[PDB]
Structures are given as structure tokens and as C-alpha cells.
């Protein structure tokens, strides 16, 4: 093994660094893990398949054009370079190494393709065809975009896309499950809260946020309990950005946003799959939880959960660590079957007013085939009316004491439409025992006299049984 010689590798500070402020990818490469045999697809505006740093790794079997309904995902060229983003993301995953061009991908021996889906009308059918592309050939899908990041939107997949996600995790990859990597959002300036985005908020997606070079929460970041982990991206004008392939056969040093973090995670996941090709979609989320690193990430909300892990709403479990992912993958025993325990909490609607607390002691399906002693995801599916939605903050506390913020105040959200059976999701209680008293808190964070009613609260627990060793 020799370190890459590509001319811009030194500028890929999140890979080439030697000050321990990086993704620890060199450690994985040094053990011989570079993505060989793994297939990744970028869901975006197209991929410049003839780019000098992509052609060597390009895979037509990982690619399709859902906008035009043909196999060739080549983007359209315009003066504003609108359709450059899929190419930038593709190079982050799998730019060719040691070829005198630009830098390298995280998984520089993986195969890379793209779905051209964003250069046209994005419909339920378009989303389903993209998420469901060749699921026994593609291992990992990377999506950097979704519903509007205006801080006012609540939106998620419709029926066909939801079914594609479920079919992907259940039957993709020969039954191991498609791995869907998602960017948690770019709406930080607008005070967006990412559990309002049903793609990143899904249990089926492995959601990723960003850290700046100096280890801070970037201006564009969205906090939420559904995020799992973090990779480096852009920040202020003293901090470096992401260096990758660009449209028109170029190299950029100015790729930015959480949309640049998801592809780096997809690349790390490709190295991990090469290390253990038998990992399921759930195994991969377990590995991320166990191995990600809070060290040197600054946040004001780090808290230790019931099993002793530090977690943040900006960062999830912390920075991805490629060396640690590959090491744990080699020792991992695949997890037991997923159980799902549905608990109807309310006996009657509850006035919200200024503040509401709902407490319920649960058994997590004790005595039944879906009894859960080892939690993975948890959802609170809430139906509520309120006069000004963005004034609400919502928290969920587990029996072991872990407080998850399900919704922070969104000052720009003046909707009067409330939430209709919306499944706010938290990863912060992973591995906890969910038996005991849960607490839901709903608060009006404004001085206004706001009003509404909580009409349904369904607590949904996922996980496994067996002795909980935490
Ligand atoms: C510079 N770039 C310009 C283009 N851009 C962009 N981003 C995002 C974009 O809208 C969207 C919108 C959605 C939301 N959904 C909800 C259900 C609706 C059903 C219906 O009514 O039929 C249809 C719309 C989802 C997605 C999406 C994105 C990916 Cl990557 C993968 C999947 Cl699966 C879904 N995308 C449109 N353009 C990114 C920035
Ligand atoms: Ca085409
Ligand atoms: Ca290169
Ligand atoms: Ca958002
Ligand atoms: Ca997710």
C-alpha cells in the first residue's frame, strides 16, 4: 500500500490529514479496504460518466436516467452549471486514485453510478424508480437532497417511495437490505428541524450531518434526533471545503453543505461492506452507532444516553471513523430479527395550551413475539392541531432518562395545519431497554397565547430481544 499520489489529495484534508481531524480513512486503506467489489449509486442531477476521475470506476449497472427514461445518466450542461452536483458527489465516493487527476474517492476502488432524477419533475413514481434501481446490483444509494429546507415544510415520501424503501431494506442485496445514506438537510439558516423531513427521519435511511474543519456546527446544519452520525464539510471562509470532481471534466475545491457529507459517509460504508459483505442494513447502523467519535466536535447539546454513549442532535453519535468501522465489521455478529412494538398511548385527546406532559409506563410487548429489550429506533407518531406550528418544541424521554428533542421551534413555520400521524424518530436511545416510563413533552416556546389539541400519540419501538448487556 502507498498513499495516493493524486495532485489534490493533500487538499483533501478530511482524508489526508495527520492532525487527527479527519475521517480515519488511511487506516482502512492500509488494511487493504478500498471499496473493491462494492457498488454505489448517487441519486441526484446526473453523473458525468466520462469525467477523467470517474470513467475508470463508472458502472452502467448502477445508473439510470429516470427524468428521460433511458439508461444514460449524463447531466445537461447550462450556463449556471445547475447539474453539477451528482458529479461532485460521485467523486467523493469513488474518484479514481493514483491517476494524476484531482484527488481520490473514499472508496477509490468501488464502482460508481448515478440516477439522473432531479433534472425534471420529482414525483412519487420518479422517487420509487430511483430508490428501487437494480437492488441486487447496487449496494449503497446516496441521496443529498429531499423536501424544501425553508424551515416551514413538513414533507416525506408518498406511497410508492415508501414501498420502495421497505422493499429495498427487506429484499435488496439478496435480503441483506439496500443501504440508503441521506443528508440531514441544509436549512440551518432558516432554523429548520430535520425530523420534519420524512426521508432523513426514516428508520430506513442512515442519516448524516456535517462538521466544519475547526470542529464546529456549520451555519447550514439542521439538528434532529433522527441523525446517526457526521462527516466533515464546509464552514466559514477560514475553513477548507470538499475537493472533488466537477462538471465539465474539472476539479473543485469548493463543494459545500450537508449535501457534501452524505457521499463521504457512503464511501466509508463501502469500505465497511468490503470488510464484511454480510452486514445487513441494520448491522450497518449498529456499526455507526458503536464506532462514531464525538471527540473534537464542539456542540452545546452533547448528552450521555442510557448505555453510556455521547449523542448530539447536531452530530448524532459523532464523526464517522473508517478505521474503526472496518475493524468492528470484521468481528460483528449479524443482529437478530427486527421486532416492532406498537403502543397506543392516549386514552382521550389532550389540550396542549402552553405546555403538556404525557407519561406512560410501558412493557414493550412483554410476553409477546415482539417483546423488545434492546432498542434500535423509536418513533412517536403524533396527531395534533395547533394554531402556529413553529412555536412548538417536542421532547421524548426514555425510561433510562434520555431526552430526545423530536421537534425544535421553527420560527418561520406559521402553518395552522399541525401534524397528521407524523412519525418523529429518535436514534438517541439505541441499545437501551425501553421498558418503563416514557414521557412526552409539548411546549409553546413563544409568549403568544397559542392553542391546540393532541389527539393521537403512538409510541413505536424497534429492536431485538435477549439479555440487555448495557
Ligand atoms: C441544485 N439542486 C437542484 C435540484 N435539487 C432538488 N432537490 C430536491 C427536489 O425535490 C424533491 C422533493 C421531494 C419530496 N417529494 C415528496 C413526495 C411528492 C409526491 C408527489 O407529489 O408525487 C414528491 C416530492 C423528494 C426529493 C428526493 C430527492 C432525492 Cl435526491 C431522492 C429522493 Cl427519493 C427524493 N426531491 C428537487 N430538486 C437539489 C439541488
Ligand atoms: Ca439520458
Ligand atoms: Ca484521481
Ligand atoms: Ca430540512
Ligand atoms: Ca434516517
Short mmCIF file of C-alpha atoms and ligand atoms in Angstrom, two decimals:
data_model
loop_
_atom_site.label_atom_id
_atom_site.label_comp_id
_atom_site.label_asym_id
_atom_site.label_seq_id
_atom_site.Cartn_x
_atom_site.Cartn_y
_atom_site.Cartn_z
CA UNK A 1 0.00 0.00 0.00
CA UNK A 2 1.14 3.51 -0.92
CA UNK A 3 -0.63 6.77 -0.07
CA UNK A 4 -2.36 8.33 -3.11
CA UNK A 5 -0.21 10.44 -5.40
CA UNK A 6 -3.08 12.43 -6.94
CA UNK A 7 -2.31 16.16 -7.17
CA UNK A 8 -5.19 17.33 -4.97
CA UNK A 9 -5.03 14.58 -2.34
CA UNK A 10 -3.12 16.91 0.05
CA UNK A 11 -6.05 19.34 -0.21
CA UNK A 12 -8.48 16.53 0.80
CA UNK A 13 -7.85 17.43 4.43
CA UNK A 14 -10.70 15.24 5.72
CA UNK A 15 -8.78 12.21 4.28
CA UNK A 16 -5.11 13.24 4.13
CA UNK A 17 -4.87 14.98 7.50
CA UNK A 18 -2.31 13.94 10.09
CA UNK A 19 -3.62 16.04 12.99
CA UNK A 20 -6.38 13.54 13.91
CA UNK A 21 -9.02 15.89 12.47
CA UNK A 22 -10.10 13.54 9.69
CA UNK A 23 -12.26 10.54 8.83
CA UNK A 24 -9.50 7.98 9.61
CA UNK A 25 -9.71 6.59 6.07
CA UNK A 26 -5.97 5.98 5.60
CA UNK A 27 -6.14 3.37 8.36
CA UNK A 28 -8.77 1.48 6.36
CA UNK A 29 -6.82 1.75 3.11
CA UNK A 30 -3.67 0.50 4.85
CA UNK A 31 -5.52 -2.72 5.77
CA UNK A 32 -6.43 -3.24 2.12
CA UNK A 33 -10.00 -1.90 2.17
CA UNK A 34 -10.66 0.46 -0.74
CA UNK A 35 -14.17 -0.49 -1.88
CA UNK A 36 -13.32 -3.31 -4.28
CA UNK A 37 -16.47 -5.19 -5.24
CA UNK A 38 -18.90 -2.59 -3.84
CA UNK A 39 -21.37 -0.65 -6.00
CA UNK A 40 -22.66 2.83 -5.05
CA UNK A 41 -25.28 4.98 -6.80
CA UNK A 42 -25.73 8.76 -6.44
CA UNK A 43 -29.36 9.95 -6.58
CA UNK A 44 -29.08 13.45 -7.99
CA UNK A 45 -29.00 15.56 -11.18
CA UNK A 46 -26.88 13.10 -13.21
CA UNK A 47 -23.29 11.90 -13.39
CA UNK A 48 -20.59 12.94 -15.88
CA UNK A 49 -19.59 9.35 -16.63
CA UNK A 50 -16.68 10.35 -18.91
CA UNK A 51 -15.04 12.55 -16.28
CA UNK A 52 -11.32 11.62 -16.21
CA UNK A 53 -11.55 10.83 -12.47
CA UNK A 54 -14.78 8.81 -12.74
CA UNK A 55 -14.60 6.86 -16.02
CA UNK A 56 -12.31 4.16 -14.60
CA UNK A 57 -14.86 3.33 -11.89
CA UNK A 58 -18.12 4.09 -13.73
CA UNK A 59 -20.74 1.33 -13.68
CA UNK A 60 -23.70 1.50 -16.08
CA UNK A 61 -25.43 -1.13 -13.93
CA UNK A 62 -25.53 1.41 -11.09
CA UNK A 63 -27.05 4.11 -13.30
CA UNK A 64 -30.29 5.17 -14.91
CA UNK A 65 -31.99 8.31 -16.17
CA UNK A 66 -35.46 8.48 -14.64
CA UNK A 67 -36.09 12.00 -15.98
CA UNK A 68 -35.76 10.88 -19.63
CA UNK A 69 -36.40 7.14 -19.05
CA UNK A 70 -33.14 5.89 -20.58
CA UNK A 71 -30.04 4.20 -19.10
CA UNK A 72 -27.58 7.09 -19.58
CA UNK A 73 -27.41 9.47 -16.57
CA UNK A 74 -25.26 12.14 -18.24
CA UNK A 75 -26.23 15.62 -16.96
CA UNK A 76 -27.31 18.58 -19.05
CA UNK A 77 -24.88 21.48 -19.41
CA UNK A 78 -26.14 25.00 -18.69
CA UNK A 79 -24.52 28.38 -18.10
CA UNK A 80 -25.25 28.22 -14.37
CA UNK A 81 -23.81 24.67 -14.11
CA UNK A 82 -27.06 23.65 -12.43
CA UNK A 83 -26.49 19.92 -12.93
CA UNK A 84 -23.03 19.65 -11.38
CA UNK A 85 -23.95 18.14 -8.03
CA UNK A 86 -24.22 14.44 -8.87
CA UNK A 87 -20.74 14.54 -10.40
CA UNK A 88 -19.29 16.21 -7.29
CA UNK A 89 -20.90 13.59 -5.05
CA UNK A 90 -19.76 10.69 -7.26
CA UNK A 91 -16.13 11.77 -6.96
CA UNK A 92 -16.35 11.99 -3.17
CA UNK A 93 -17.29 8.30 -3.10
CA UNK A 94 -15.16 6.82 -5.84
CA UNK A 95 -12.87 9.18 -7.74
CA UNK A 96 -10.03 7.15 -9.26
CA UNK A 97 -6.75 7.05 -7.34
CA UNK A 98 -3.12 7.34 -8.49
CA UNK A 99 -4.03 8.70 -11.94
CA UNK A 100 -2.64 12.25 -11.83
CA UNK A 101 -6.13 13.79 -11.77
CA UNK A 102 -7.89 15.80 -8.99
CA UNK A 103 -7.96 13.76 -5.74
CA UNK A 104 -9.38 10.38 -4.68
CA UNK A 105 -12.65 8.91 -3.52
CA UNK A 106 -13.06 7.47 -0.04
CA UNK A 107 -13.71 4.13 -1.74
CA UNK A 108 -11.45 4.65 -4.74
CA UNK A 109 -11.81 1.04 -5.96
CA UNK A 110 -15.60 0.94 -5.67
CA UNK A 111 -17.83 1.12 -8.73
CA UNK A 112 -19.92 4.28 -9.01
CA UNK A 113 -23.07 5.19 -10.87
CA UNK A 114 -25.83 7.76 -10.73
CA UNK A 115 -29.56 8.16 -11.11
CA UNK A 116 -30.48 11.27 -13.05
CA UNK A 117 -33.71 12.15 -11.22
CA UNK A 118 -33.57 15.80 -10.12
CA UNK A 119 -33.41 17.43 -13.59
CA UNK A 120 -37.15 17.17 -14.07
CA UNK A 121 -40.37 16.83 -12.14
CA UNK A 122 -39.83 14.82 -8.95
CA UNK A 123 -42.91 12.63 -8.41
CA UNK A 124 -43.70 9.61 -6.24
CA UNK A 125 -43.18 7.36 -9.27
CA UNK A 126 -39.83 9.01 -10.06
CA UNK A 127 -38.64 8.57 -6.48
CA UNK A 128 -39.72 4.91 -6.35
CA UNK A 129 -37.99 4.07 -9.64
CA UNK A 130 -34.79 5.71 -8.37
CA UNK A 131 -34.75 4.11 -4.90
CA UNK A 132 -35.55 0.74 -6.47
CA UNK A 133 -32.93 0.72 -9.23
CA UNK A 134 -31.18 -2.66 -9.65
CA UNK A 135 -31.29 -3.51 -5.91
CA UNK A 136 -29.38 -6.79 -6.33
CA UNK A 137 -26.50 -4.98 -8.08
CA UNK A 138 -26.24 -1.66 -6.20
CA UNK A 139 -25.18 -1.95 -2.54
CA UNK A 140 -25.44 1.67 -1.34
CA UNK A 141 -27.57 4.60 -2.50
CA UNK A 142 -26.54 8.17 -1.61
CA UNK A 143 -29.10 10.99 -1.65
CA UNK A 144 -28.12 14.55 -0.74
CA UNK A 145 -31.49 16.26 -1.25
CA UNK A 146 -35.18 15.99 -0.38
CA UNK A 147 -38.01 18.27 0.76
CA UNK A 148 -37.54 22.03 0.83
CA UNK A 149 -35.18 23.37 3.52
CA UNK A 150 -37.16 26.57 4.13
CA UNK A 151 -37.85 25.87 7.81
CA UNK A 152 -41.59 25.74 7.10
CA UNK A 153 -42.13 22.40 5.34
CA UNK A 154 -43.29 19.04 6.68
CA UNK A 155 -42.97 16.51 3.88
CA UNK A 156 -41.90 12.93 3.26
CA UNK A 157 -42.17 10.03 0.81
CA UNK A 158 -45.54 9.13 -0.67
CA UNK A 159 -46.82 5.57 -1.05
CA UNK A 160 -44.68 4.26 -3.92
CA UNK A 161 -41.46 5.71 -2.50
CA UNK A 162 -42.28 4.38 0.97
CA UNK A 163 -42.85 0.93 -0.52
CA UNK A 164 -39.56 1.17 -2.43
CA UNK A 165 -37.66 1.94 0.80
CA UNK A 166 -39.29 -1.01 2.55
CA UNK A 167 -38.75 -3.37 -0.39
CA UNK A 168 -35.14 -2.18 -0.54
CA UNK A 169 -34.29 -2.89 3.10
CA UNK A 170 -36.29 -6.15 3.14
CA UNK A 171 -35.29 -7.70 -0.20
CA UNK A 172 -32.45 -5.66 -1.69
CA UNK A 173 -28.92 -7.03 -1.69
CA UNK A 174 -30.13 -10.63 -1.62
CA UNK A 175 -32.11 -9.96 1.56
CA UNK A 176 -29.36 -8.07 3.40
CA UNK A 177 -31.06 -4.75 2.58
CA UNK A 178 -30.21 -1.73 0.44
CA UNK A 179 -28.24 0.87 2.38
CA UNK A 180 -29.82 4.30 1.86
CA UNK A 181 -27.50 7.11 3.01
CA UNK A 182 -29.17 10.51 3.43
CA UNK A 183 -28.04 14.09 4.04
CA UNK A 184 -29.92 15.53 7.03
CA UNK A 185 -30.51 18.95 5.42
CA UNK A 186 -29.14 22.40 4.55
CA UNK A 187 -31.79 24.53 6.28
CA UNK A 188 -29.87 25.77 9.32
CA UNK A 189 -30.12 29.46 8.37
CA UNK A 190 -33.91 29.06 8.35
CA UNK A 191 -33.93 27.25 11.72
CA UNK A 192 -35.09 24.04 10.05
CA UNK A 193 -35.51 20.94 12.24
CA UNK A 194 -34.80 17.78 10.27
CA UNK A 195 -37.42 15.46 11.78
CA UNK A 196 -39.82 17.46 9.55
CA UNK A 197 -38.13 15.74 6.55
CA UNK A 198 -39.58 12.22 6.21
CA UNK A 199 -36.66 10.97 4.12
CA UNK A 200 -33.94 11.71 6.65
CA UNK A 201 -36.38 10.95 9.51
CA UNK A 202 -36.98 7.38 8.20
CA UNK A 203 -35.56 4.34 10.01
CA UNK A 204 -34.66 3.04 6.55
CA UNK A 205 -32.14 5.80 5.85
CA UNK A 206 -28.76 6.23 7.52
CA UNK A 207 -28.72 9.98 8.07
CA UNK A 208 -25.59 12.14 8.15
CA UNK A 209 -24.85 15.72 9.28
CA UNK A 210 -21.78 17.96 8.93
CA UNK A 211 -18.90 19.38 10.95
CA UNK A 212 -16.64 22.25 9.91
CA UNK A 213 -12.86 21.89 9.69
CA UNK A 214 -12.40 23.51 13.11
CA UNK A 215 -14.92 21.07 14.58
CA UNK A 216 -18.00 23.31 14.78
CA UNK A 217 -21.66 23.06 13.76
CA UNK A 218 -21.88 24.77 10.33
CA UNK A 219 -24.32 27.58 9.60
CA UNK A 220 -26.41 25.33 7.31
CA UNK A 221 -26.78 22.37 9.72
CA UNK A 222 -30.16 21.09 10.90
CA UNK A 223 -30.39 19.44 14.31
CA UNK A 224 -32.71 16.49 14.94
CA UNK A 225 -32.92 13.22 16.84
CA UNK A 226 -33.11 11.11 13.65
CA UNK A 227 -29.49 11.78 12.61
CA UNK A 228 -26.98 8.97 13.19
CA UNK A 229 -23.50 10.42 12.51
CA UNK A 230 -21.40 13.18 10.91
CA UNK A 231 -18.76 13.76 8.27
CA UNK A 232 -16.71 16.88 7.61
CA UNK A 233 -17.89 19.53 5.15
CA UNK A 234 -17.60 23.30 4.62
CA UNK A 235 -17.83 26.14 7.14
CA UNK A 236 -16.59 29.75 7.26
CA UNK A 237 -14.11 31.39 4.89
CA UNK A 238 -11.09 30.37 7.01
CA UNK A 239 -12.10 26.68 6.88
CA UNK A 240 -11.44 24.40 3.92
CA UNK A 241 -14.18 22.75 1.85
CA UNK A 242 -14.69 19.48 -0.05
CA UNK A 243 -12.38 18.76 -3.00
CA UNK A 244 -13.84 16.58 -5.74
CA UNK A 245 -14.68 16.04 -9.41
CA UNK A 246 -16.74 18.78 -11.06
CA UNK A 247 -18.89 19.13 -14.16
CA UNK A 248 -17.02 19.80 -17.42
CA UNK A 249 -14.14 17.44 -16.53
CA UNK A 250 -12.87 19.85 -13.82
CA UNK A 251 -11.80 19.69 -10.18
CA UNK A 252 -13.48 21.81 -7.49
CA UNK A 253 -12.20 22.77 -4.06
CA UNK A 254 -15.49 24.46 -3.13
CA UNK A 255 -18.07 21.68 -2.64
CA UNK A 256 -20.19 22.60 0.38
CA UNK A 257 -23.09 21.78 2.67
CA UNK A 258 -24.58 18.69 4.27
CA UNK A 259 -25.16 17.54 0.69
CA UNK A 260 -21.38 17.01 0.57
CA UNK A 261 -21.35 14.96 3.80
CA UNK A 262 -23.65 12.11 2.73
CA UNK A 263 -21.34 10.92 -0.11
CA UNK A 264 -18.32 10.74 2.20
CA UNK A 265 -20.40 8.56 4.52
CA UNK A 266 -21.48 6.40 1.57
CA UNK A 267 -17.80 5.88 0.76
CA UNK A 268 -16.97 4.88 4.34
CA UNK A 269 -19.89 2.45 4.29
CA UNK A 270 -18.47 0.96 1.07
CA UNK A 271 -15.14 0.29 2.80
CA UNK A 272 -17.07 -1.33 5.65
CA UNK A 273 -19.08 -3.58 3.32
CA UNK A 274 -15.87 -4.73 1.65
CA UNK A 275 -14.63 -5.67 5.13
CA UNK A 276 -17.80 -7.70 5.85
CA UNK A 277 -20.09 -8.21 2.86
CA UNK A 278 -22.65 -9.97 5.06
CA UNK A 279 -23.64 -6.84 7.04
CA UNK A 280 -27.36 -6.08 6.83
CA UNK A 281 -28.87 -2.59 6.61
CA UNK A 282 -29.44 -2.76 10.38
CA UNK A 283 -25.96 -4.11 11.13
CA UNK A 284 -24.53 -1.07 9.34
CA UNK A 285 -26.49 1.32 11.56
CA UNK A 286 -25.28 -0.57 14.65
CA UNK A 287 -21.68 -0.19 13.48
CA UNK A 288 -22.11 3.57 13.01
CA UNK A 289 -23.60 3.93 16.49
CA UNK A 290 -20.79 1.97 18.15
CA UNK A 291 -17.79 3.44 16.31
CA UNK A 292 -18.54 7.11 15.67
CA UNK A 293 -16.43 9.62 17.57
CA UNK A 294 -17.63 12.73 19.48
CA UNK A 295 -14.03 13.76 20.24
CA UNK A 296 -13.14 17.21 18.91
CA UNK A 297 -16.69 18.03 17.76
CA UNK A 298 -17.99 21.10 19.56
CA UNK A 299 -21.68 21.28 20.44
CA UNK A 300 -23.75 22.66 23.28
CA UNK A 301 -26.08 19.65 23.49
CA UNK A 302 -23.85 16.59 23.99
CA UNK A 303 -25.58 14.24 26.42
CA UNK A 304 -24.84 10.70 27.56
CA UNK A 305 -27.64 8.21 26.93
CA UNK A 306 -28.75 5.19 28.97
CA UNK A 307 -26.00 2.91 27.66
CA UNK A 308 -23.17 5.40 28.17
CA UNK A 309 -22.80 6.80 24.64
CA UNK A 310 -22.48 10.52 23.94
CA UNK A 311 -25.02 11.85 21.46
CA UNK A 312 -25.88 15.24 19.95
CA UNK A 313 -28.79 16.44 17.82
CA UNK A 314 -26.30 18.20 15.52
CA UNK A 315 -23.91 15.26 15.16
CA UNK A 316 -25.68 12.08 16.18
CA UNK A 317 -23.06 9.74 17.63
CA UNK A 318 -20.21 11.82 16.22
CA UNK A 319 -17.73 11.71 13.37
CA UNK A 320 -17.56 8.58 11.25
CA UNK A 321 -14.31 6.66 11.81
CA UNK A 322 -13.46 4.46 8.82
CA UNK A 323 -10.69 2.51 10.54
CA UNK A 324 -12.97 1.70 13.47
CA UNK A 325 -15.88 0.79 11.19
CA UNK A 326 -13.79 -1.73 9.25
CA UNK A 327 -12.28 -3.17 12.44
CA UNK A 328 -15.67 -3.74 14.09
CA UNK A 329 -17.15 -5.10 10.86
CA UNK A 330 -14.61 -7.93 10.92
CA UNK A 331 -15.76 -9.02 14.41
CA UNK A 332 -19.51 -8.39 14.07
CA UNK A 333 -22.23 -11.00 14.59
CA UNK A 334 -25.27 -10.16 12.46
CA UNK A 335 -28.22 -8.97 14.53
CA UNK A 336 -31.39 -10.89 15.42
CA UNK A 337 -34.66 -10.29 13.52
CA UNK A 338 -36.21 -6.86 13.78
CA UNK A 339 -39.18 -6.59 16.15
CA UNK A 340 -41.73 -3.77 16.12
CA UNK A 341 -43.86 -2.96 19.17
CA UNK A 342 -46.74 -0.51 18.68
CA UNK A 343 -48.17 1.15 21.79
CA UNK A 344 -51.24 3.40 21.73
CA UNK A 345 -50.57 5.94 24.48
CA UNK A 346 -53.64 8.22 24.74
CA UNK A 347 -56.98 7.30 26.31
CA UNK A 348 -58.52 10.66 25.28
CA UNK A 349 -57.38 13.83 23.46
CA UNK A 350 -55.27 16.25 25.49
CA UNK A 351 -55.30 20.04 25.43
CA UNK A 352 -51.84 21.40 24.60
CA UNK A 353 -52.16 25.05 25.57
CA UNK A 354 -48.90 26.44 26.92
CA UNK A 355 -47.46 23.02 27.82
CA UNK A 356 -48.49 19.36 28.00
CA UNK A 357 -46.74 16.37 29.56
CA UNK A 358 -47.90 12.79 28.86
CA UNK A 359 -46.40 9.99 30.97
CA UNK A 360 -46.97 6.30 30.31
CA UNK A 361 -45.37 3.18 31.75
CA UNK A 362 -44.96 0.56 29.03
CA UNK A 363 -43.93 -3.10 28.97
CA UNK A 364 -42.56 -3.02 25.39
CA UNK A 365 -44.69 -6.01 24.39
CA UNK A 366 -43.59 -8.23 27.31
CA UNK A 367 -44.83 -11.80 26.85
CA UNK A 368 -45.31 -11.40 23.08
CA UNK A 369 -43.24 -12.29 19.98
CA UNK A 370 -42.39 -8.60 19.50
CA UNK A 371 -41.07 -8.01 23.03
CA UNK A 372 -38.12 -5.60 22.79
CA UNK A 373 -35.33 -5.49 25.38
CA UNK A 374 -32.68 -3.92 23.11
CA UNK A 375 -33.98 -0.80 21.38
CA UNK A 376 -32.91 0.43 17.96
CA UNK A 377 -35.07 3.26 16.57
CA UNK A 378 -38.07 4.71 18.37
CA UNK A 379 -40.87 6.80 16.86
CA UNK A 380 -43.54 8.97 18.42
CA UNK A 381 -46.34 9.19 15.85
CA UNK A 382 -48.23 12.35 16.77
CA UNK A 383 -51.51 13.79 15.50
CA UNK A 384 -52.14 17.29 16.82
CA UNK A 385 -53.73 20.60 15.92
CA UNK A 386 -52.05 23.89 16.75
CA UNK A 387 -52.54 27.48 15.61
CA UNK A 388 -48.83 28.21 14.90
CA UNK A 389 -46.83 25.05 14.31
CA UNK A 390 -43.33 26.57 14.54
CA UNK A 391 -43.86 27.71 18.12
CA UNK A 392 -43.92 24.08 19.34
CA UNK A 393 -40.98 22.19 20.78
CA UNK A 394 -41.48 18.48 21.49
CA UNK A 395 -39.31 16.17 23.61
CA UNK A 396 -39.44 12.45 24.38
CA UNK A 397 -37.74 10.98 27.47
CA UNK A 398 -36.94 7.27 27.70
CA UNK A 399 -37.24 5.22 30.92
CA UNK A 400 -33.45 5.28 31.32
CA UNK A 401 -33.64 9.08 31.23
CA UNK A 402 -32.51 10.05 27.71
CA UNK A 403 -34.12 13.25 26.44
CA UNK A 404 -34.61 13.34 22.68
CA UNK A 405 -35.73 16.55 21.01
CA UNK A 406 -38.32 15.44 18.48
CA UNK A 407 -39.01 19.00 17.26
CA UNK A 408 -37.34 22.32 17.99
CA UNK A 409 -39.04 25.67 17.47
CA UNK A 410 -39.11 26.68 13.79
CA UNK A 411 -39.78 30.45 13.90
CA UNK A 412 -40.59 30.68 10.17
CA UNK A 413 -43.24 27.91 10.30
CA UNK A 414 -46.58 29.71 10.66
CA UNK A 415 -48.64 26.73 9.44
CA UNK A 416 -52.01 26.11 11.09
CA UNK A 417 -52.08 22.51 9.80
CA UNK A 418 -50.44 20.76 12.76
CA UNK A 419 -49.16 17.20 12.36
CA UNK A 420 -51.15 14.30 10.88
CA UNK A 421 -49.82 10.98 12.22
CA UNK A 422 -46.23 12.21 11.78
CA UNK A 423 -43.62 9.68 12.97
CA UNK A 424 -40.92 11.71 14.73
CA UNK A 425 -37.91 9.39 15.08
CA UNK A 426 -35.02 9.20 17.56
CA UNK A 427 -31.76 7.23 17.41
CA UNK A 428 -30.61 8.56 20.79
CA UNK A 429 -31.87 5.59 22.85
CA UNK A 430 -30.21 2.90 20.70
CA UNK A 431 -29.40 -0.20 22.81
CA UNK A 432 -31.47 0.99 25.78
CA UNK A 433 -34.07 -1.16 27.47
CA UNK A 434 -37.38 0.56 26.57
CA UNK A 435 -39.47 -0.92 29.43
CA UNK A 436 -40.70 1.61 31.98
CA UNK A 437 -41.98 5.17 31.96
CA UNK A 438 -41.74 7.27 28.80
CA UNK A 439 -42.55 11.00 28.89
CA UNK A 440 -43.70 13.19 26.01
CA UNK A 441 -43.37 16.98 26.48
CA UNK A 442 -45.02 19.53 24.18
CA UNK A 443 -44.27 23.21 24.84
CA UNK A 444 -45.27 26.54 23.36
CA UNK A 445 -41.90 28.31 23.20
CA UNK A 446 -43.47 31.70 22.31
CA UNK A 447 -45.05 34.33 24.53
CA UNK A 448 -48.13 34.20 22.27
CA UNK A 449 -51.37 32.64 23.52
CA UNK A 450 -51.29 29.56 21.29
CA UNK A 451 -53.69 26.64 21.43
CA UNK A 452 -54.41 23.17 20.11
CA UNK A 453 -55.02 19.53 20.93
CA UNK A 454 -53.02 16.30 20.86
CA UNK A 455 -55.36 13.62 19.54
CA UNK A 456 -53.03 10.66 18.99
CA UNK A 457 -49.65 9.53 20.38
CA UNK A 458 -48.43 6.12 19.16
CA UNK A 459 -45.07 5.00 20.55
CA UNK A 460 -43.37 2.63 18.09
CA UNK A 461 -40.33 0.69 19.31
CA UNK A 462 -37.99 -1.31 17.07
CA UNK A 463 -35.27 -3.69 18.16
CA UNK A 464 -34.49 -7.15 19.44
CA UNK A 465 -34.86 -9.38 22.48
CA UNK A 466 -32.31 -11.14 24.67
CA UNK A 467 -30.42 -10.06 27.76
CA UNK A 468 -29.56 -6.37 27.57
CA UNK A 469 -25.85 -6.13 28.45
CA UNK A 470 -25.69 -2.34 28.87
C1 LIG B 1 -29.16 22.25 -7.10
N1 LIG B 1 -30.06 21.10 -6.97
C2 LIG B 1 -31.27 21.31 -7.75
C3 LIG B 1 -32.15 20.07 -7.70
N2 LIG B 1 -32.44 19.70 -6.30
C4 LIG B 1 -33.65 19.21 -5.92
N3 LIG B 1 -33.74 18.73 -4.67
C5 LIG B 1 -34.94 18.26 -4.31
C6 LIG B 1 -36.03 18.28 -5.15
O1 LIG B 1 -37.30 17.86 -4.75
C7 LIG B 1 -37.50 16.70 -4.07
C8 LIG B 1 -38.70 16.66 -3.38
C9 LIG B 1 -39.01 15.51 -2.67
C10 LIG B 1 -40.30 15.40 -1.90
N4 LIG B 1 -41.31 14.56 -2.55
C11 LIG B 1 -42.44 14.32 -1.64
C12 LIG B 1 -43.49 13.43 -2.27
C13 LIG B 1 -44.03 14.01 -3.57
C14 LIG B 1 -45.03 13.05 -4.22
C15 LIG B 1 -45.80 13.60 -5.38
O2 LIG B 1 -46.45 14.62 -5.31
O3 LIG B 1 -45.69 12.87 -6.46
C16 LIG B 1 -42.86 14.32 -4.48
C17 LIG B 1 -41.80 15.18 -3.80
C18 LIG B 1 -38.11 14.46 -2.69
C19 LIG B 1 -36.92 14.59 -3.41
C20 LIG B 1 -35.94 13.48 -3.49
C21 LIG B 1 -34.59 13.74 -3.72
C22 LIG B 1 -33.71 12.68 -3.82
CL1 LIG B 1 -32.02 13.00 -4.11
C23 LIG B 1 -34.12 11.37 -3.70
C24 LIG B 1 -35.46 11.14 -3.48
CL2 LIG B 1 -36.02 9.50 -3.35
C25 LIG B 1 -36.37 12.16 -3.39
N5 LIG B 1 -36.63 15.70 -4.10
C26 LIG B 1 -35.84 18.83 -6.40
N6 LIG B 1 -34.65 19.29 -6.81
C27 LIG B 1 -31.26 19.64 -5.44
C28 LIG B 1 -30.43 20.89 -5.58
CA1 LIG B 2 -30.04 10.17 -20.52
CA1 LIG B 3 -7.72 10.96 -9.07
CA1 LIG B 4 -34.75 20.24 6.23
CA1 LIG B 5 -32.70 8.22 8.88
#
